[model samples]
Target chain A: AWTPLEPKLITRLADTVRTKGLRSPITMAEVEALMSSPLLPHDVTNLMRVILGPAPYALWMDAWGVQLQTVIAAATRDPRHPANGQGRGERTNLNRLKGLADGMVGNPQGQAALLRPGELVAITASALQAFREVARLAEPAGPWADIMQGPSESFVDFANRLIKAVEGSDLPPSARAPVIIDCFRQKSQPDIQQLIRTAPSTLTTPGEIIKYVLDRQKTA
Target chain B: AWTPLEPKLITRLADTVRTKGLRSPITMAEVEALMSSPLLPHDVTNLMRVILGPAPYALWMDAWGVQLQTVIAAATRDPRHPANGQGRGERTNLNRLKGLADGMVGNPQGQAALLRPGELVAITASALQAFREVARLAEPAGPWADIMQGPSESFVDFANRLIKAVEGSDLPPSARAPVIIDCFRQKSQPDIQQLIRTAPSTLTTPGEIIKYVLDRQKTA
Candidate 1:
């Protein structure tokens, strides 16, 4: 009593639509080739359409338009993602995130932001006290166990807390603006943005991202 | 009026030979060009030979040889040639001759046979001192003055003095024989011999002689 499923018919439809969409499995080699290639008629047309893409219009008009909706969701949600916060995976992710933050914001600026007045001082004091307790315990693996297991707050939460502390401090806004702008500029650079957008498709390592950003800044 | 006139044909022939033997004027450019030629044969053949030809050779050999003979005659005629010495020219020649000797016979065994304990020490000391003085006085304009000015002594008389000094030394005959042989061998080494042979041809300054000898020793 079921209607016949037309596999060939569906495949033909897919082939026609596939040409209009982005190519799957985006690779550095492919991207580099594209960047160097002379513009073809179809490619030019496609680029023009993308610049005038309807998705941006849809994102702008919807009640929960893409930009504001995403921002609001991110703010309201818990800082720690449930899947990463549950197990040993959480600690690994934290370390990776810490390394990412360290690389994204280098020394002086990173240190300034991480160690601000008020709440930052209180948080660091508590963390150090905890660290001392672990030092006294001197467990088989020592501080690593404490580092991995002791902290409950996510890196995002910690960064936000540090930001608040910095905002409340006596440091001049003019001095802080440059550091914040530098951090934002680094994060929003074209290559970094592309990398983050296509992160799932690309096997982007944190170290490679750090190197790419630093190298770009250096050459610039 | 009836007496037969003798022709001075022999004197004319000698004058002709002397005139023909004189070198043509050689510019520095010609000498440099000839020396720098890629395909030139003969290791000791230089631009000076092309420019100055055989004249410089004749002059240097004639002068130096005469100086040597004069010193030999003086020393042989008067043993006091060693103590009181002759003219400045003779003293300068004598010191250079000793340097040539020490350079010939500085090895332990060579030293023992070429010069007796006191004689070798004294001759080497005097020669080294003279070498230092010559080096100090050596100027670009008058190098030959310092070189040829050493004590006037013939090669024969110098060799004899060296022999006499060795024979009179306390070293046994067995020890002295090898030393003398080694001293001669060192002097006769191809590179050293080449330097000695070429030194007179290019003899311009005392510094040049010192540099040439030092360079030759380095290769040796």
Candidate 2:
């Protein structure tokens, strides 16, 4: 009599079926049909996976999708977008959700719902509640301990001193106007502003930052 | 009747006759006849002045001789004396002299003596001497007093400190080796050493130092 399969083996087989079996086994006839069909264009994803194996192919596909989405987002925000404003809003929102998967479980359906104006307001209110929870966990300490353990106050002090120094002074007329004019010149470009705003938060992997910047430029 | 020439004009005419009357003028026809004739070519001096006017050209000819002798003296010292060596005894001496001139004079002689050995050395020596005088004058006090009234020890302090630091052993081996090697390499090269030794009694010029280093590389 045939021995029963072990429980571990059974669970493993089930898991494999749930994941890899989404695309079922191919018959010889189906393979032959795929090879012979002139009307059907090649599936690049399948072709690459066949050559480079599934792991590397999957990584490359993910990279390409992230890049495409970044481009679309940058394009949508810049009114003088270099690539024009087509297909940007939806694609950028999709990419942002994908990026959030790094630290948290992504909720694409929730993100999509929030894209609507009233839904966005509701989501923003929930976010504010979440922010309150974060703040409650962070308490203020005192003096030297506060200086070491809390948010910096030196910047605030510096800002107050700077205000006093500039009040009714010739320095503002001499330096501030020229500097502000230069800043305006640098940031007035719509495409550049959009690229800055939509850029990925932490492009930790090699080539990721460069790819993001290039993609933004391409879309702009 | 014509009035006697002015005393200054008379003196000028007499001086010219004394100088030029020593040489005989030869026309192009005479030169051509001599080329055909079986006559020996005599040792010629100031031959150009006999053809060209004596006023400016004669002065130039005299100056040219002085410059040539200076270059020759720089290249090879009289070997009998021991300080300066025999005439063109070694390529080392010639190359060293060239290196000096290239550094000091640059393109002073235009392109004519650019590659000439002796010209470079003479010009370099003069330049180095001039530079040394300037450096000496920069020091207003101490033994160099009466030269000028300014900072006495800028570069002197810098050089002394640099030498002392090099002699001291605080630096890492990696950093120290390259510097030591540079000094040793500069000393070992014949052309460079010659330039250094023959560099005017005064301190060396930057140009001469650079030339000495570069010319050494060529021979190396």
Candidate 3:
């Protein structure tokens, strides 16, 4: 069921998610509608948009949405489900995680795939934990968002460059994903604020962020 | 039922599987041998070495080893399981993916958790394809294993950096996981290689490798 979809598709899905175009906490009926749609011809461009109703967050929100629904439903089944602790906090948190994850991954399997080992022993709890993790990690912190995309490089290249930015930071790989996601989250901001808010789309590495503004300016 | 043992326990278990110290392809008999063993008391340093042998890969190898053995056996049961397309090529490929994943995961459930969604549609083929995808990514035809670990960060940090590395490369978040594993794989070099062939301990991630190399260097 994995789409051999190109990066353009993935990129667009991410874009749709970031734009806040899709409804937050999308409805199940909406997801089902999208899931049942025939795999439109391979060249389907506006296919998802027309079906999903304009701004699309994930490439396959329907499928992944259903998956989360099932897991959450089952988790709800056991009133004592670990994630259900506080009776409701877990449910809402899982909901947020699902939306956040789908925003980035239209790929259905990614949810389960992302959980750390040992997490599967208790699906609901681990998922709640994993979601909290995504949100926790995604939360903007420190000077991380200050990164900038590189000049003349693809968005992806700029990211590779951004990874290079973590070199001097004290954060470890576990912590780095959030920071990277933070950069993406921040970059997703309005076009104008990208540079001034922290770093802009032009700067590649953190070091460049300095000369980034200096080089761009000409007070003379 | 779940031991929730520390990383050290998981490390030896994986090591136990690879060597005859456990068994071929890891059968239930081998798994039971491990499962039945007395849960070592906490802080029982090197207790497993005195029991299972000195080197270990993961704590729950007992549970995961059987999962692999079953699938590989069935793949051998009748040839041409979609992934076995090459007949012999894919078999060897999956075995390696399994080992490499367990090399660090050491969690039995992670084997299934790591599977892409539809693979569960057909266990063996799905598992094989997923692993092959990882191996395929890890093979790194162009400029792979070429990236640096950076100003010396933790193995985990290096992995995070590697995930960022995937940015412009066209690899998706799913593919990024394997590449992250690969970065860890490449970084696995330096001290123990294989089993220790620069492979280091199975504690997983780069930061541990940091302590790993330093520790080995000191011991030597």
Candidate 4:
């Protein structure tokens, strides 16, 4: 006789899902607190009836992405699911939100990264619009991530790099800002900080600025 | 047998004609000094052809449009002409330039007014173009002269009136300025004088200054 889920576990799992949903940059350490959480292959009921299967890779993340991610992780290790009791390879890869964890770590393009889960949820058209924005930046990931995740020499250099990228990109300012914001999310540059605060719209490519500043530095 | 215009007077008359040809808004006192100037007409052939006569009323004044007016005026008034020496009405009209005297008095449109002389000799097409200008402002002389000749309460009033008249007149600004200049020629109004001096173009139309100024003053 298979036992039903514990009355307390059900509520706790939901709570964990909600909690992870609220956080971004989810981590494995963060996951351990909940990893008590899929791919299933089996055969049995076939009375010539079959309709529907699990959703194909549900997208979307934010704190909630992680929340659900943690919830799934929690149930996988809950000691209730047979897949986990087998341990290691026998675990059948229960970490569906493993991607969410990667997202929280800020490296791989996972749930939180796709939807700009930190600032806005991809619920409205604007939400997806912003999503499209990050996705566009996502295309050059192999190299782009190298740069975004790379260390800028200094704040001035960071600013210079930002200006150069903006000038080089053919994308609209709407798309450019989010990417710029995301690139700088891990650290703060005072000029950029002041810029976004003062005139958010003004961060377009500052053409000729570097040339003007550089020439201004030359000898008599 | 007779005294020629004093040897100096002949040269002096020519000099005066040339002189009046230069200065503008020709005044009465100036005319007397110069009435004493080119130009001609036709009467009867001779006594043999019957009673000789003076030229009919000449259409001239400093010296209708310039020295030409004075020359005609002189011939008409000169006692040296057989016509003037002859006698009364029989002399026909010997002093046509007497009108020149009137023009200098600031009463009639005699010489400089008609030909639009003064400074411009009408050699260039521009002079003729300017002459046509006054002709256009030549609407109803009856009213124009009164308004142009009548004195205003003050110079500011004069400027105001000129502006009003100009506004009311279908004539263009080129035509209007002269008439205004002529009207105020006899009397000096400091405001109009200053305005005309500082920015001649401003006289075009100040437009609702009092209204604009008053509106500027109010606040809640």
> Which predicted model would earn the best lDDT?
3
TM-scores for chain B, listed for all candidates: 0.19, 0.19, 0.22, 0.20
TM-score per prediction, in order, is 0.13, 0.16, 0.23, 0.15
Q: Each model's number of backbone clashes?
A: 20, 3, 31, 26
Q: What global local distance difference test value does model 4 have?
A: 0.31
- Candidate 2 vs candidate 4, TM-score winner: 2
Per-residue lDDT value at A190 in model 2: 53
* Candidate 3 deviation (Cα RMSD): 21.8
Q: Docking quality tier of candidate 3?
A: incorrect
lDDT of 1 at B215: 35
Better of 1 and 2 by lDDT: 2
Q: Write candidate 2's Cα lDDT for A108-202 as tens digits.
A: 22333333233223223333232222122111112111112014233224333333233223343456433332232243345444554565554
Off by over 4 Å in 4: A1-220, B1-122, B125-137, B141-220
What DockQ values do the models have?
0.00, 0.00, 0.03, 0.00
Cα deviation of B130, candidate 4, in Å: 7.3
| lDDT for each residue of candidate 3 in A1-220, tens digit (9 for 90 to 100) | 3242332333334334434433333322333333332221111222332223211112133333444566666666765654354535435334434435332123233533343322233433332233233322222222444656554444544555566555334466566655655565467324424544665455444445444544554444
How high is the lDDT of residue A77 in model 3? 75
Cα lDDT of model 4 by residue, A12-92, tens digit? 333443465322223213332322221100000000001101010111112123343444465466655532443444332
Q: Report the poorest 10 consecutive residues by lDDT, candidate 3 chain B.
A: B36-45
**Residue A100 in model 2: shift from native, Å?**
64
RMSD for each of the candidates: 41.1, 37.3, 21.8, 43.9
Q: By TM-score, how accurate is candidate 4?
A: 0.15
| Clash pairs for candidate 2 | A82-A220, B77-B84, B101-B120
Best by TM-score: 3
